[model samples]
Target: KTVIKNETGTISISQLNKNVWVHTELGSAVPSNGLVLNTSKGLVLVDSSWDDKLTKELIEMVEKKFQKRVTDVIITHAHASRIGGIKTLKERGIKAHSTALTAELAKKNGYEEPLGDLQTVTNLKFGNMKVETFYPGKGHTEDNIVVWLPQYNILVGGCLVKSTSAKDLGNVADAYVNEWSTSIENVLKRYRNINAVVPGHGEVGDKGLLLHTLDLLK
Candidate 1:
């Protein structure tokens, strides 16, 4: 258990395995969070924080705590909080990867940094570990994707799934509400043995988060 407490709130770093960690930082507007995977190649990041400053802080914390260079940044959606740090990653020589749709969406939304293709439901490998980024239809956004860490039975549900305490879908400006529940159901069907579920915001939990998100949709 790695914890970083600041003026805002706490940033909890929970270990999924020896190398994979779910970093949840509490802050403004939405749930500020991401993933930190220490791989044989280097460090693989799932999503950046809400902004450039937070992203830098997160990167510093990771490097300072784990002493590993972040080599790849994988985005789960086109939201600024999720994909905003591409510029910082690029400047730091870290490659950024996202679904083709997410890339297109990000570009249209004014994020200029280039992102490599993650492709829908594609499996990306790092040494013996494999991370699967799957598009479980639309939920929070048309380009929203979830990352599955098969080795650890973990799911980074991004904004598609809501926290148990979330009163309602936080952001639906670009969401598919009519298809949200069904989309989350697809995630439940596709991945089993999910030990922990990390949402785009709020405290992490077990498979319960998925169910809570479904209920919120109803």
Candidate 2:
């Protein structure tokens, strides 16, 4: 139960397991959660924070704590909170893995370009850690994808799946309201008995978080 907070109080990383950790960075008081996977190969990041400064702090904090450089980052979508640190990732020569649509949206939104190389169902292995990135239809954003750790049964739901406390979908300007629930169902069908589900923002929960998100959309 060790939680590490940066001196500036912008980032807080909590160890969830020996190989899995969750980090939260605040955009003012609005907290965002992302995964910091300590794979045997090195490190794999799930999402970025709000801005370069915050993302930079997050990168440094985790690298110091884990004593390994972040090798790859999976951007869930093109949102500022998810893809903001992509520029920093590029600066560090870290691979920013994203979808072709996410890359298109990122360029449209004026963010740094991410390598749009991932497929619909990409299984990436970093040392002994197995990661599965799947596109379960579309919800929060057209290009939003979920990261699944089959070994740990941990689902990084990102913004597409809401936290228990989330009243409704946070930003629907780029969302597909009609198709969201169906998308959530796909995730439920794909992964069962999830030990931990990390929402894009809020407390890490179990499968209930995914169900709760469906409730909000109703």
Candidate 3:
């Protein structure tokens, strides 16, 4: 697939299908992935970029490409790579959705709080597109969550799952290693027939990504 890489090469967007696009941004030499979902109402983002600058560019690029303004965002966790664009989203009057725990964690991490309106399993429908956010325990971070696109069969695993190529668990400072596998099993039992799985970093894959992450936790 042809990717739309910015002039500075700091941000790139690649299409997963017609309405789903993956936005990859590099910060501190690490590539972070998020999704831009184009729905009939407007655009819905899975997560934010590394910071406000890249997030701003990400919005501009996605809006220009899809000809729709971003209506809302679902932050998967309190990590900088996930919720760093809270200010940018708020300044634009776009809704930022997160769990209560994530909201508190965001504030403690020095970022603005999100809407914190989602529950354990929240299903939101924007036009014909259906999006579900699941909090299947904790792994990467105590507040990490995952987004599922039922119609598209895509799971935005966030940092909770790892890519197949990942050599090791990158960071476990806030990880719950003992419960990580069980959390993944929660996801496995919740969704079946997944077409694509997007990791917080590295290349996207299929169900193997989830299993790979479980192995990494082992």
Candidate 4:
């Protein structure tokens, strides 16, 4: 565990696996989990949670804990809590990437264009690490994407996958209920070897996370 406990106890970082970490933060929005992947190139961040102050602290903690600067950030969706730290990251010269639709929706919400705009599926390389970010159709939002690290057998389902404790599809204001389950089905079909799954909230699980999310859509 790479803990960074503050007096306020608002945020902390914990290693999910080798070179992979989860940053858990709580504040205005619901508690969220962002990912940190340390690659030979540098660190890659996925999802920048709500508070700018806490987000900055997260970056610093990653730097100190992992001894690597975050070079890229990937926004899983356009929600405020998900894309909240883009400005802070920009100030530090970190390049950000988001799906084309996510970029558009983010713009509508007052965010500048990400450094890189991806299509439905984009293959990225961080040093020797190959990462795939794919859109499996509409679920939590029209632009929700999952980050797949085939080498690690890890699937970051973003908000598209739910934790075991989740009782229902949460915050569906931007969701497509009619298509949510289908989207998750597509996710299951696309990534078959997931040994570890990280949901946007709650405890990380295994392949069961995908099944659990599909169950929630019903």
By TM-score, highest first, what's the ranking?
3, 2, 4, 1
Q: Order of all candidates by lDDT, from best down to worst?
A: 3, 2, 4, 1
TM-score of candidate 2 against the unseen true structure: 0.97
Model 3's C-alpha root-mean-square deviation from the true structure amounts to 0.9
Shift of residue 157 alpha carbon in model 4, Å: 0.7
Each prediction's whole-model lDDT (CA): 0.81, 0.91, 0.92, 0.84
Clash count, candidate 2: 0
lDDT of 1 by residue, 1-218 (tens): 65554456545566766888877664463457688998887788889876777777778878878787888888888887887777888788888898778888888889855574877678898767799999899889988889999888889988887888899998688989988888898999998779888888877888999999888888
What is the per-residue lDDT of model 4 for residues 1-218, given as tens digits with 9 covering 90 to 100? 55666566778777877777887888764678878898999988888878578778878877887788889988999887778888888888988899878888888888866654787889999987788999999999999999988889888888898899999888989999889889988988998778889899988898898888877777
Q: Give the per-residue lDDT digits (tens) of candidate 2, residues 135-169.
A: 99889988889999999999999998888888979
Off by over 4 Å in 3: none
lDDT of 2 at 162: 88
Clashes of 4: 0
Candidate 3 local lDDT, 151-185, one digit each (tens):
98999999998988897878899999988899999
RMSD from true fold, candidate 4: 1.5
Estimate TM-scores for all models. 0.92, 0.97, 0.98, 0.94
